Design a protein around this ligand. Structure first.
Ligand SMILES: [Cl-]
Ligand SMILES: [Cl-]
Ligand SMILES: [Cl-]
Ligand SMILES: [Cl-]
Lengths: 396, 389, 396, 389
């Protein structure tokens, strides 16, 4: 009976491999997943798990899977939590859960372990995912439930001669992948404190490139990003290219006070240049290709989807049913959106679509005008009638 | 029996005064309302109506009224139609309706006239307004219903050249229509803009600004007390100097078509952005989630010409309660056409440093979390079990 | 170039056949559709159109199509307009539109005509349907737009010797099909006037069957009614059998003040015994088979669907997208609901399902109890935390 | 320092008074609240707490307060959880919390105790209530957290036999739990019922009743003025005699499970049905459509133990505005377990006979309709054209 845990090569979890081994008497399988977080080579991470006592240590390249099956759905629901940020650090959790469960089935795992705390959202996203996909697996939360701390890890590593880097942690706690980057530091827990330049990495300062804005065309086919400036791309490639081009213009710097599911507010810093460009473009394309009342209701389902995924309910039946709604709406969301990236800002300035609902002749007053204005007087009379009857009663 | 109409000194409406006089055989009262649109001196405009045959010509300074009773409600509901622009050209319409009805009561008016077309939103906002506030008044729509045009005006009759731009502006914002931009692949050029400078002009000098609210009403800038009108004006200037509030939208008109519109709303966008940030500090989670729904609905109602509808009025009662504690200051940087938030403080804050921190003062009881997650996830986990059975 | 019109054998429309012929110079094709309205034999109706000058007169049996593709979707969205009645007289309109358009393509029709007035909902349901399915067809509304009245019809019939029954119209205006019956009479336009026995037809007085209530089991498979008391049925058969059994118990008598789309309130009388039994049962089954938060949101989409269909927007993209949402939700809506029909009332008293989300062992305090109560204290603490923080601020 | 607890004279809680005394070494104050539950005389109950070691034992008559400030809000939001039952056993909880907190302030209480289990909703309604109104008070849950049972009670220690029924009732309604009905294919038998008679009993004598409201508050029955409490009581009797308000529900508990519940709520169902009918007469279309959404949300909030939440409070401000004109009378027939509506009248009616009728007085201008339909259908028709292209 194995313990399966997600592994990124850090101090606490590296030491947790042998500690879990000694605490449970079970062998540990480390699962490292490439989601485009950069940093150390995946093989170096893989080997570290082995050197720290893992019986098996595997690397999964899930970058395309993440882009295709997690980022694209977020784009299709224009997902912006608090109407501010695109679920950075929420999207990858169900993917990680799915791979941990798969590895448990393959490597005789009966227990999965995670390192989330009791005041974050990630504990919810992991544990609700495990309860939904594999309720037979026991779940261990060493940090939340067994007081597993850095200090305890270091003492255990010393006593057991675990080969691990215990040099001072920098003031920043970083969580990043190809979709975006989250930064935590003590200084920014005070709401009147502004971030400094050292907080950023994915993006340049928005004062760069004064005379060199970047005009970009992003194309979609049925709600999926498929081209940039006429060049075909995969969804992963689209995210990566727009991370670069957006980042070079300071785009996607986010500074949010958000509502955590566990009942408290917290101040967070995010960088998500490519995500914000893609969601902004996708929204502009829906304004060209989706009918009025469908769009008004879809703003409601967009919001609900974002809430469900934030709240650790990716696998919930309401989320799954909303995806069937979304899929139908995306049928004709096909076209290109032109934007200028500059000064930290995304400015739209062009649209074209073979599925456009914009009708030049209905809108124009030019010679081609086809709008029958004789209908309007009667429309306004009936549109206003029920509230006018109510007003009469009020004023009587 | 008289005809009342809104008047801004334009050619078409100036002649319409005479033409309505001949056609209906009735006297005409012109009503010019100052909403911060600039342009000609109001007294010059007032006199022109008289010279064109109006029996009465009045001027109303409604700038503070507009700011206080129309713009502030838009701020309190974070109003952004299509999630893009702050109801530029929608907010002033119910105010103008109210003043035209008042003028009708004061000057023996039995008819009100407007110059809206049959494919715009303004016809709805005016006519639903009239039907609600004063159903006894006949409504005359010479442009939509009687083929009144600049050409008919000139023929009937000081003629200025036709502008390639159709501009509608007041202190809250500016809307620009031009034929070139009816093509969606055409980008705006610099001559469309007026309220705002290009982001590149004052790039070297970013503007950090603090905006304070009291019960959801803007009341200070950088510590200086301001009226709501002064707030809008100052942030128009400071935002405009940084290119903030330039909007380019494809929107759904109520009459069933999409159209491409250009807006400038620097002050409005700073105010609505700041107000939203302050609600994230001062409103509880689930109240905030539901208020995003009512924010959206309010914006749709006002867009749709339903300012005076009973649902809009009832939402205002909801909104007023939510605003009780929306008090505090938001610090932002205006630069590059962008609004960046970087600071909040509030005497009504729901942010609790000790509950959030992992530092020594941490007060969060993590022992509650395992049980919470178990029950929070239970119903969907039961459904999953059934699915996978 | 033909004119196509829907035809049920009545006075106004019978005379309209030759009048339209004389007014437009075009030949008229009459289309009669069996939706289970009973009354005259369809062949008698068909022949009448011919005797009144139609160049072609066709009968379409659409009873199963109506049940399968219109009534079943209403059941799946629990459709109750004003939370009161199941869209009686709204559901069949898009079906009728579809068949009128089909007949136009088959019989060289360039014009479709309808007899709706300018203050009803039916004008909207017909004309928005025609604009969506066949905008190339001209639409004629003789009653609304050309002052076509009974009195004008009778005078035209006399002058042109049209063979048609012009005997006094009874005080009631009835619109019925297998899904339900709508009754209009002048007396009931006064809100303090109660209906009399003569108003009813589909249902017995609810005082009948004192000692003989009817307990019925209705089964569904993926949201579709498929059995009654263990006997397999088609959806049409289910509606018909429950019309009878419900009607014999006075079930489905409805007396509503409703909001018409054209801005006014009106008082309406409906009989819909089978529809109310099916919608009530379907709702009870969703309470057994759909998860909590999915159910809460589905009450929202149920309401929206009912509004769209009432408002003549059956063919709208929001309605079509909601159907994709609904289809996913119905995947596991499978089981049986036992109800007692009696005294005008539907009383549920039993449920069973092979897809049940009810868990006896989690609910019971009996020996089999599996609910872990140790989780509850912490759940309540966090569930209440955000509103408790807000209360503290309020009270400070 | 004292422990405060709600008390109804039951065996388990009577002994708990002593047991809490020994365990915590603290004095206990029992609080008995009259909500129309019937049963033992309140003074007898009061005395029993004293005989069991309580230092103070008080009785509160909260019947009118309950009706006025808890039941009437439920009526105004047409509250029906799962669209089935009117929050029986949910409404009284915040009232009881308020009185327990008050008693704590009056009698030096630093701890409040409740007897809720870990799988019910009541634990949430009590504990969220305490956390909101009085976070300084420690909450003790002997049944959930300290394994307190009838068996532990009897062991620790007048013992009555155990009923096969767990009953929770007050003037608003009655809830019944019994093991037999935990099986969903089992139907209730006649012994489950008490507030209501079988529909067959008084079948021969249907009861036509008129219920009047003033600003959404019930104020008359058959022309006779009544208080809200009297309204609930009279309609309990008249509805109950006709078998009205018998409910059999599978509901979603907040703690993640479904459960089967039996309710009797004759008066509540008559009142909520009538109130809904009156809103259909007095509220405009779109306001009514949106209010169905807020009705639903309010019901969920109160079910979920969030009576005191800021979203619930803000919805009450919305609701109060909507109720301004909800005034008039609704005529219904009670028979066969069913409520049939057959009459409405209102001095605030939005029904307009002349606009609706085709008779000689018809005032509806049908010339508006063709244009209305053309534009109402335009956006979806444009989308259809695109679909079919
Ligand atoms: Cl992520
Ligand atoms: Cl405006
Ligand atoms: Cl129908
Ligand atoms: Cl209660």
């Amino acid at each position: 009976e194995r313990v399966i845990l997600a592994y990124s090569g850090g101090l606490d979890t590296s030491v947790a491999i042998s500690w879990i081994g000694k605490e449970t008497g079970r062998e540990v399988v480390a699962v490292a997943i490439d989601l485009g977080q950069g940093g150390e080579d995946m093989e170096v991470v893989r080997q570290r798990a082995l050197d720290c006592g893992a019986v098996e240590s595997i690397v999964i390249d899930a970058r395309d899977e993440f882009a295709n099956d997690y980022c694209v759905p977020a784009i299709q629901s224009n997902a912006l939590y608090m109407d501010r940020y695109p679920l950075v650090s929420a999207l990858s959790r169900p993917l990680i859960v799915k791979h941990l469960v798969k590895a448990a089935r393959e490597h005789g795992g009966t227990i999965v372990a995670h390192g989330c705390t009791g005041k974050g959202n990630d504990q919810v996203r992991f544990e609700v995912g495990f309860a939904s996909l594999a309720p037979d697996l026991e779940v261990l939360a060493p940090v939340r439930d067994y007081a597993w701390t850095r200090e305890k890890a270091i003492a255990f590593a010393e006593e057991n001669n675990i080969p691990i880097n215990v040099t001072k942690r920098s003031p920043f706690s970083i969580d990043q992948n190809v979709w975006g980057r989250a930064v935590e530091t003590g200084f920014l827990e005070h709401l009147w404190n502004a971030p400094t330049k050292d907080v950023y990495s994915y993006t340049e300062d928005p004062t760069v490139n004064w005379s060199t804005p970047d005009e970009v065309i992003v194309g979609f086919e049925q709600g999926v990003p498929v081209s940039i400036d006429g060049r075909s791309v995969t969804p992963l490639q689209a995210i990566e290219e727009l991370n670069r081009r957006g980042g070079e213009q300071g785009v996607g710097r986010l500074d949010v006070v958000e509502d955590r599911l566990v009942g408290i507010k917290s101040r967070e810093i995010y960088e998500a240049p490519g995500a914000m460009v893609l969601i902004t473009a996708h929204t502009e394309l829906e304004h060209v290709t989706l009918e009025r009342e469908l769009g008004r209701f879809k703003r409601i389902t967009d919001q609900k989807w974002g809430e469900l995924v934030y709240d650790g309910l990716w696998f919930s039946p309401l989320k799954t049913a909303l995806e069937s709604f979304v899929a139908k709406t995306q049928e004709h969301v096909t076209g290109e959106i032109r934007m200028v990236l500059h000064g930290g800002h995304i400015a739209v300035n062009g649209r074209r679509s073979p599925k456009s609902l914009y009708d030049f002749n209905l809108a124009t007053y030019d010679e081609g005008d086809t709008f029958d204005q004789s209908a309007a007087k009667g429309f306004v009379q009936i549109h206003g009638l029920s509230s006018s009857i109510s007003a009469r009663r009020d004023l009587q």
